[PDB]
# Entry
Amino acid sequence: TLCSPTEDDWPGMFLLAAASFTDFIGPESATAWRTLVPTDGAVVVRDSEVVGMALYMDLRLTVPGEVVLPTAGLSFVAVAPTHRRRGLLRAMCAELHRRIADSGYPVAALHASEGGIYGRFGYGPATTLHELTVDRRFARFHADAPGGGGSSVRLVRPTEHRGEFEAIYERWRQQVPGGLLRPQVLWDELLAEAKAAPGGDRESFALLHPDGYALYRVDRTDLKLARVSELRAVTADAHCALWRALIGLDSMERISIITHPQDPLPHLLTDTRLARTTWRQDGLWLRIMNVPAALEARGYAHEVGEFSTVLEVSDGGRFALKIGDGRARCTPTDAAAEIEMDRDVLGSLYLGAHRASTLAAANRLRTKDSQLLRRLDAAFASDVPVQTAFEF
Amino acid sequence: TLCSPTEDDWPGMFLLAAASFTDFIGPESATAWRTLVPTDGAVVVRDSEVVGMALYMDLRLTVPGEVVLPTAGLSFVAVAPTHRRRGLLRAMCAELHRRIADSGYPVAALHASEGGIYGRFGYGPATTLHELTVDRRFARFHADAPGGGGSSVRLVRPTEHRGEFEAIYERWRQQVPGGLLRPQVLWDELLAEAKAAPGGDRESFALLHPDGYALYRVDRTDLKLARVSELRAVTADAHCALWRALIGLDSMERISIITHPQDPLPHLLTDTRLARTTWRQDGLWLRIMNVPAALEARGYAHEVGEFSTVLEVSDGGRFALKIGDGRARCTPTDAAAEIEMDRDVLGSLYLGAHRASTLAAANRLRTKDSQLLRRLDAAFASDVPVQTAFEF
Amino acid sequence: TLCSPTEDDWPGMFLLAAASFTDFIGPESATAWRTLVPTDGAVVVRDSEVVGMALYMDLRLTVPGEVVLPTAGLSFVAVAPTHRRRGLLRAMCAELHRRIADSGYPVAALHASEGGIYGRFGYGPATTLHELTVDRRFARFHADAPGGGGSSVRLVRPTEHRGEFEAIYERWRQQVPGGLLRPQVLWDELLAEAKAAPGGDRESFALLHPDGYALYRVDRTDLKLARVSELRAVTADAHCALWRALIGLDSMERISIITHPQDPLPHLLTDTRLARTTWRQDGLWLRIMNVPAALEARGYAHEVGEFSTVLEVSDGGRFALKIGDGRARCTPTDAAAEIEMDRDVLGSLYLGAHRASTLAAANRLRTKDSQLLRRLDAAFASDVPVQTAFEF
Amino acid sequence: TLCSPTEDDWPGMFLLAAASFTDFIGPESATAWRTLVPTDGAVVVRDSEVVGMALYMDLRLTVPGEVVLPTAGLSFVAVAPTHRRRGLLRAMCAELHRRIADSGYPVAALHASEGGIYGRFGYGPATTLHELTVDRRFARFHADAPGGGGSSVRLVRPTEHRGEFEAIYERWRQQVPGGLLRPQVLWDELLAEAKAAPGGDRESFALLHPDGYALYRVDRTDLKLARVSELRAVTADAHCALWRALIGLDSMERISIITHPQDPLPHLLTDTRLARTTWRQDGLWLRIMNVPAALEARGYAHEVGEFSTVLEVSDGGRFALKIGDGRARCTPTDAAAEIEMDRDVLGSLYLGAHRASTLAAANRLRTKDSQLLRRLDAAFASDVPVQTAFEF
Ligand SMILES: [Cl-]
Ligand SMILES: [Cl-]
Ligand SMILES: [Cl-]
Ligand SMILES: [Cl-]
# Structure
């Protein structure tokens, strides 16, 4: 049977969690994340022990046009290894989606453990994780790079500058598509992870600028690699200044960061090739819950002239879509469809990370008009490049 | 001293080549590539032995709008290890650029051995190489993917279907920015490399469709890896059909290809994550020789409304640039600059591989108007994604 | 500005330390090492936070002839990654050298994080670290090797035999060039490191002989490798007996030790090749602060007949150097130089680790007389091979 | 039975060779090396097939004092895997040593396949192979390094400059202890190996100076490693000039060379640590056949004053040894021994690669007088550092 969990169910859920997630944050930390789950935000399957669970958290997601949407963040999704191929995932996703839609969320979001699961439930990959590794021994800043003229950056202990990190992040998340509000409990969690653990991670340090910060630590095993866990810069000056400081970590051979495809770091160096892409993966996945609410909520490129089309989402409705002056109107119609796509495809287009033209070339997006394709491409494009905030 | 080489100089140039290039194609093959070098296309430095050399080949490069430009392809550039830090590279590049400009080439192009060299001579990286590795054991085609309904693809010996490869490639290179005309000597060279070599590469096979081909071989050392040397598809149907056949290589674990960032392959699969980005690097580099000729020659996005600005290229002139109805007019002016950039930056923008906004964020492109930045971004964008033809 | 640190500065110095040194011993241990730093032995740069620091400790260094010199041991040298290329290192080294020279130290010493830094400040590499790895499964002792006839060696817990280790080390450090006095705080530190740490190093064991000891532990990750942290032997009998016991660690495949190039271990085995050199690096670096005081203080080889020359140290003075009966007299002169060298070169010659002839072949040491070169080589040679005591 | 081989035996010897030596040069090349084997220079054991073989070649070895000794070079030593532990090696070594001693050779020499075999037959390791790997991307020459002011070095094809290589090598081998005369057949062999082989080694190049040459090739598998097979420099200027050219191989990450422990290369660089010791091994092994002839033939250090002692070689005679003015007189005596050592130990001392003091510390060399030890150390030391010529 499928139920909202009682307080009695949570020890059983933590057991399933520990057995399902190698990166399980543990019961103390999980209890803190729990404060972000609304009443009726969780489902469990009992056989009595917990053999399936899924929940969503109340999130705030920034989309193009600096618009902030209420977002259901799916998380803590697990089926017991004893109960595979019994349709438990489908049943739990159907119930949560029912609750999320009824609660009035226009979008749901998740981070996927595997890439093959969530497409069939209407989730499309919406942000791209891009790992850059810099061999900092060869790194020289271009003549054009800002801040090559005191340093504005300070090396600090993260726990002593929480207020400054919170304020910089709050500015960042409001101006960048993919930005998430980071509540106080997640700041508590982040700064507890900044601590060195015996047999675990090394101490984290911060580089602090008025308009940016970098959190980094030396890798556990590779003592010549510094991993930047987080760099939030609100200005180009802040971004360059922080990278000048990171390239100044003279005891390291390599600096690595999980960033976005449009990170300007390579262009700050005389040799763009030194900032090597070592890893690429889907970041945030989006399911558009309400097509017209979602399409009307975001801003569109002003550079494209007013145009009208008919969009059909497979079992998601058909809409007269009019885009002009950076705004969309999206109304019901029975007029012939000019564009067809599955719900997951719309999620992938929504933050501007994937081009309509690319999805059309894979036949994930069907139209008979190449002009309409170019107009969609241009309109859905994001002025500010889409980034990934934090994993949940 | 710096001279055009005589026939007597070429053995000395082949020695320097063998000592400079681990992938040196050898004197027979080098003599065939020589047929693409015009009279006065080569310079040598003698100390008497050859201690420096550089040449350019007559190429035809496709740019956005399906426009074909005469292009000087720099190649075979080497300074003897005995004559480093003597300004030989600067002297040879200055002389060839003089000859290329005087001959009336609007653009020069090269493939860079290192990323830190050619920026200072006005070359910007203009295409992006993107290696995808597919674990084909898990690869399943999406319900939406074309051609899941006889097969239109044939497994053939490359040497027996030269005419068909030539015709498909000729269609491809004319419609794709980054496309190069492949002369008969380079078809001779390609199909000679398709042969198995004792102690060297394994036999190459071809997958042939009416509207595409793939050339592939099993890796020398990794016998569970097939490397696609070349996939040219003129239709989405051809692209999907060829990938269905490659995923059908049941004796392989992995298929790898050097492609472009907008390759739709990931979107053909139920799990987009199976097409892993394993390597990323600059491909073709461009030096704009004549700013107004180059800017007027290419097509621009129709989606952006007519706009005017003043572009200054650092020691490259200042121009009144008017872009409307997908065309540019670029005339001399002494009016105040609204946009400033080095010549290399313009090369990087020219085929639409890099966004003005990204280069602006690194301060490689200076303007005080963010609206102008969005308009440049939109205008210079390529409808057909930029690809890399063949290395030279 | 550049100041001696107050008690308030030390938390800021520990932050810079933690961020600069992956092997940072932590504030408790650093506070113990602090007891070896004299009043005015430390400098800091403030921007207010600590952005640069450097100090020296009062050490006692054994040089050829069993002569013990007061030595300034430079340590804890760091510039913040935010303040690179601002001349902070040069400023801090200039001030400490001023204080060290004025305090009457004839020599300064350090261990170098990188090999390219300290040459320009007059430091030359003076000892050579030589890692030997023995595949002990094949190791058989030569018929000639001592102690192949009860065992004189005991397997003990290090913490229970501190008095015996202290007494053996005190005998060792007084008879070996490179020997350092090990104060009580460093014995406290060493025997605390002998403990097993959860997620860290395994338990240390000791092999104890009347005239030697070995400290060893099994490697964290490679459980078939025993690492000898320290072997101090005052007699050849002790050295051989300890190696017989180490080769008796039948659960190990390999024994590794960081020793000196003249370690006789290879010659104790029937197969000298079993003691493989797996790593070689500069150990102790010396800056001669007072040329005449340093040259007069050490003993010279008795085998070379009395000779006189004129030595010029680049911006270090010119001296009439007379060496006879194992003693040097070194007096000011304006007579023509017969030998010229930078100060760093003299440091490299001083403990007999590097031959004048080898440095002459690199033109680091200039003379027009090859007989003088042979005489310098012979005179500066050390009867007892130079070893490295402990890192600081 | 044990016989000198007939012409009929050599096919059987080549079979045993092919099965015994993974680096077997093949019958053509082996037939060329054969020209260096004197009449009665070879023994075979037949069971009829060849189950054991050993031979010596007529060599000329340079020893300290630029003295050239006739030397029996043992080579091509093999016992069939079917005939191990049957005393065939002992029987063949006894017969060849009988023939070598009777023929009037003062010394025999070999390169050892394993380090544990040849000690018991009186061979001691006499030279040390020292592999240096330079990360040439970081390598900068010291201000003091010669030739930092045209280049005197030429990049050439080895086969076109045989005369120049022969003349430089002939100068080198006469002035360096360990030097071997390289006959014309071995020059034929060397320049045939300079060729690229299909599925094998890449093409060899030469760097040619009036007073030195380097032979190098790119590694088969590691295409960023250049291996210097041979560098012969007669002057410090030649040595530095050749290394400036090798560091100029800008397509390589690393240059490796098998050199000697006193190679001045590290001291030519601003960072001595960049020239990393990656491998160390015994090179040439010596068996002193006639103790008095060998000890009287070499020159001794002039810096040590005249001294007399009594040397006993274990089953090798007892001698009154008087060393003065760089010469030794070595006459029979029954006077009490002051120094005792096995024959192999004398071989190890003979070229100055190993110190008497080091061998004494392993009890391989016994005396009750530490003054005598220092005098032996000083006297047997080589002014010109011992190098290894070519493997045989
Ligand atoms: Cl991101
Ligand atoms: Cl491509
Ligand atoms: Cl040591
Ligand atoms: Cl050598």
Q: What stands out?
A: The CA atoms of residues 142 and 270 of chain D lie 5 Å apart. Residues C 259-260, 387-388 surround chloride ion (ligand 3) (CB under 6 Å). Chain D touches chain C through 53 residues (CB under 8 Å). Chain D has three domains: 1-126+283-287, 127-282, 288-383.
